[PDB]
């Protein structure tokens, strides 16, 4: 068995991490004190949940997680939440002064002061790994810690682990939920510096997650708790193959192979259905075809964009619950007709499919209803570059006046890394367009 180390950075990373690990625990039947009755292999095992937990002589199951935040507030609620006993104190690293929404403050100034400290706590879990796979790095494009300390940490990992895989779960910036006006600067800065260091990144545009919570959960103004519990659901779907017996997506390498043919263009759009409100008393359970059809409605994507006007390169379907291959190929057949699904000429027009029979797990007291079957489609369509256009445009508007540029320079940065990280983007948008016309 091969292990996976999760790295939650910033507030967005750390709070999304809470949402996930809590969910993992319910799914795997671990309780908040780290005891897992069903594990008979006490103090060890090369089981598939051991990819995400290690076991202790006393039978505790302990996240292969580390949480890093330049600021003590958020990780302190980790330090004191229902899942306190879960983590080893060394796993929860904390600064004192945050990076004030400032990419340069987080990467340079404050970054340099903790990068060494983090990488030792990371090497501490790497040294409990018989065959380390890689890292799942959770963060936001917008926080200064989110954006700036992640790129520093990413670069180092590419140095102290050149042979392992790096995967990203990144929160893309949405003004309804946003904490800041300079988030377009941090997004571009962090993508340019992080790009050659991530093997596959799943973007979650808070805009998307927010409207889903309003439309399909009848939640008037979603909180981060609303959003994060929904984002874990998708994270769990995406990581389930690593933690469960299966034949599809069994190591972090497989995500590159399956979803990323060209390396830069490594941002697979995720669509997920069905999102059903736990308040609805009468509900009609959706069919394999109804849910699989919903993977091609934009209203279900983690990023709003129009995959009709773009081309595919890969496509997984991750089912959890009462699904059998036959109903899948049926829904696929009918959908192939009625939808505009164009692949790049140099890729087969196929669907790699995974089914896990354990139906989706919902947090007792949450906003999501339990369901008989659910699916998470992962499709690397070029239509996600719409997100790069949008963000890049905002960046352009502010940068033409050099508004806020000085806050960054003042931390040691150089007005040139601005135009350099944006040229990279300008490449990326061109790459996408070549592949998509």
């Amino acid at each position: 068995m091969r292990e996976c180390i999760s790295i939650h950075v910033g507030q967005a990373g750390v709070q999304i991490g809470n949402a996930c690990w809590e969910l993992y625990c319910l799914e795997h039947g671990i309780q908040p004190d780290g005891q897992m009755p069903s594990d008979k292999t006490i103090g060890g095992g090369d089981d598939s949940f051991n990819t995400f937990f290690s076991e202790t002589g006393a039978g505790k199951h302990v996240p292969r997680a580390v949480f890093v935040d330049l600021e003590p507030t958020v990780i302190d609620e980790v330090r004191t939440g229902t899942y306190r006993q879960l983590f080893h104190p060394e796993q929860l690293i904390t600064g004192k002064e945050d990076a004030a929404n400032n990419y340069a403050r987080g990467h340079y100034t404050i970054g340099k002061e903790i990068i060494d400290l983090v990488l030792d706590r990371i090497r501490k879990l790497a040294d409990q790994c018989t065959g380390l796979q890689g890292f799942l790095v959770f963060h936001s494009f917008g926080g200064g810690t989110g954006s700036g300390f992640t790129s520093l940490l990413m670069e180092r990992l590419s140095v102290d682990y050149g042979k392992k895989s790096k995967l990203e779960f990144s929160i893309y910036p949405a003004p309804q939920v946003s904490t800041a006006v300079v988030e377009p600067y941090n997004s571009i800065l962090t993508t340019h510096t992080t790009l050659e260091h991530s093997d596959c990144a799943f973007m979650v545009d808070n805009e998307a997650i927010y409207d889903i919570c309003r439309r399909n959960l009848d939640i008037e103004r979603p909180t981060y708790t609303n959003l994060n519990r929904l984002i874990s659901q998708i994270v769990s779907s995406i990581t389930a193959s690593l933690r469960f017996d299966g034949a599809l997506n069994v190591d972090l390498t497989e995500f590159q192979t399956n979803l990323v043919p060209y390396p830069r263009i490594h941002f697979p759009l995720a669509t997920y259905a069905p999102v059903i409100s736990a308040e609805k008393a009468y509900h009609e359970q959706l069919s394999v075809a109804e849910i699989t059809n919903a993977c091609f409605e934009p209203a279900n994507q983690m990023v709003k964009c129009d995959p009709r006007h773009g081309k595919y390169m890969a496509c997984c379907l991750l089912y959890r619950g009462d699904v059998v291959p036959k109903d899948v190929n049926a829904a696929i057949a009918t959908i192939k007709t009625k939808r505009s699904i164009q692949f790049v000429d140099w890729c087969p027009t196929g669907f790699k499919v995974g089914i896990n029979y354990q139906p989706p797990t919902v947090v007792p007291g949450g906003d999501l209803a339990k369901v008989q079957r659910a699916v998470c489609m992962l499709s690397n369509t070029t239509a996600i570059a719409e997100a790069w256009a949008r963000l890049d445009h905002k960046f352009d508007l502010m940068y033409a006046k050099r508004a806020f540029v000085h806050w960054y320079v003042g931390e040691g940065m150089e007005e040139g890394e601005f135009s350099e990280a944006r040229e990279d983007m300008a490449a990326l948008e061109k790459d996408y367009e070549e592949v998509g016309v």
Binding site: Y108, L248, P325, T349, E414
Partner: protein
């Protein structure tokens, strides 16, 4: 519509379905750039502390 590599197991199954065939910088390099921006900071602060001295 060809189904393939169908693996089963007790937890679920997996398979593929085709509808149609086709047609890093160094630690020191980091240390440099990191430290160049610590200088640029210490210079700018010195120009401040100098001007305040005036």
């Amino acid at each position: 519509m060809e189904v393939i590599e169908l693996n089963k197991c007790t937890s679920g199954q997996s398979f593929e379905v085709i509808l149609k065939p086709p047609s890093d910088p160094s630690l020191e390099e980091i240390q440099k750039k990191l430290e160049a921006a610590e200088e640029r900071r210490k210079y700018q602060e010195a120009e401040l502390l100098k001007h305040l001295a005036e």
